[PDB]
C-alpha cells in the first residue's frame, strides 16, 4: 500500500486511540447486521437473530478483536500485505469459501465504525488514507484465490 508520509502519520495516530475492546466487535457486528448472509459463517456464535443479540454477543466481541488484530498487523506491514495475510487468505479462500466481496464490505464497515467513534476527527483525508489500508487488506486476503 502506497501511503504518503502525512497519511501514514495520520493513520498511525488515529489507530493508537482506537478502543481495542469495542471497535472490532462493532465492525464485525455491523457486518452481520448490515449484510445478513455473513451470519451463515458464524453458526457456532449462537443467537444473531436481532441487532441487539448480535452486538451483545461475546463471541462477536471476541472474534471482532481478532479481526481488529489482523487489520493492526496490516498497518504494521503495509509494504508486505500479501505475505502477512498469506495463511489467513488460505483459511478464508480454501477452507471457509468466503466470497472476496465480503472482505471489501468488512473493510468499509470498519471505516464506518472509525467514523462513528471519532466523529468530525475522522476527516475526509484521514478516511482517504484508511480506504487505501482496507483495500490493501481486502486484496491481500483475496490473493490465494489464484
Amino acid at each position: 500500500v502506497h501511503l504518503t508520509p502525512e497519511e501514514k502519520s495520520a493513520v498511525t495516530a488515529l489507530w493508537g486511540k482506537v478502543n481495542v475492546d469495542e471497535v472490532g466487535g462493532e465492525a464485525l457486528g455491523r457486518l452481520l447486521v448490515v449484510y445478513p448472509w455473513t451470519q451463515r459463517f458464524f453458526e457456532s456464535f449462537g443467537d444473531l437473530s436481532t441487532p441487539d443479540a448480535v452486538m451483545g454477543n461475546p463471541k462477536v466481541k471476541a472474534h471482532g478483536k481478532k479481526v481488529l488484530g489482523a487489520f493492526s498487523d496490516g498497518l504494521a506491514h503495509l509494504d508486505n500485505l500479501k505475505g502477512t495475510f498469506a495463511t489467513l487468505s488460505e483459511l478464508h479462500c480454501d477452507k471457509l469459501h468466503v466470497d472476496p466481496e465480503n472482505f471489501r464490505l468488512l473493510g468499509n464497515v470498519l471505516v464506518c465504525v472509525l467514523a462513528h467513534h471519532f466523529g468530525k476527527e475522522f476527516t475526509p483525508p484521514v478516511q482517504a488514507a484508511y480506504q487505501k489500508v482496507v483495500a490493501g487488506v481486502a486484496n491481500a486476503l483475496a490473493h490465494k484465490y489464484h
Binding site: 467514523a115 462513528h116 475526509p124 483525508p125
Partner: protein, 141 residues
C-alpha cells in the same frame, strides 16, 4: 427491497439529518473524491478544491434528490425518473461509483449523527441507498 422497519428507520434518520442534508451531501462528495480519485473523472468541469462553492451547490442537489427519494420511497422509479435518465443514459455512471458515494454518505452520517447511527439504522440506510442506486443506474424509460 426495503422492509417497513427500513422505511421507518430511514425516515427517522433523514428527519434528524434535517437542515444539514445539504452539508452532508457536500461532505460525502468530498470524501468520495479524496478516497476514490477515479470518481473525479465524472466531474472534469468542477472546481474540486476544498470548500468549493460548486461542490457545496452540488451536495445540496444530491441531498435534495435523496430527500425526494425518502418522501417517495415506494415510487422511486417515477420520483427519480429524470435523475435515472441523467445518470444511466447521459452520464453512463458505472454502478461501482454509487457504492462509493453511498459508503461516503454512511461515513458522513456516522461521524455527524452518532446517536442515530445505530446498527439497525446503518443497515436500513445502506439498503435505501442501494435501492436509490439501482434506480439511478437502470434504463427503464
Amino acid at each position: 427491497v426495503l422492509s417497513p422497519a427500513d422505511k421507518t428507520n430511514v425516515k427517522a434518520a433523514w428527519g434528524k439529518v434535517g437542515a444539514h442534508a445539504g452539508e452532508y451531501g457536500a461532505e460525502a462528495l468530498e470524501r468520495m473524491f479524496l478516497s476514490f480519485p477515479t470518481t473525479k473523472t465524472y466531474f472534469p468541469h468542477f472546481d474540486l478544491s476544498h470548500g468549493s462553492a460548486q461542490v457545496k451547490g452540488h451536495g445540496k442537489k444530491v441531498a435534495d434528490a435523496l430527500t425526494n427519494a425518502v418522501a417517495h420511497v415506494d415510487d422511486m422509479p417515477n420520483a427519480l425518473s429524470a435523475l435515472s435518465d441523467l445518470h444511466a443514459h447521459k452520464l453512463r455512471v458505472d454502478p461501482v461509483n454509487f457504492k462509493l458515494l453511498s459508503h461516503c454518505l454512511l461515513v458522513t452520517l456516522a461521524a455527524h449523527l452518532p446517536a442515530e447511527f445505530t446498527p439497525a439504522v446503518h443497515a436500513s440506510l445502506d439498503k435505501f441507498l442501494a435501492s436509490v442506486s439501482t434506480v439511478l443506474t437502470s434504463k427503464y424509460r
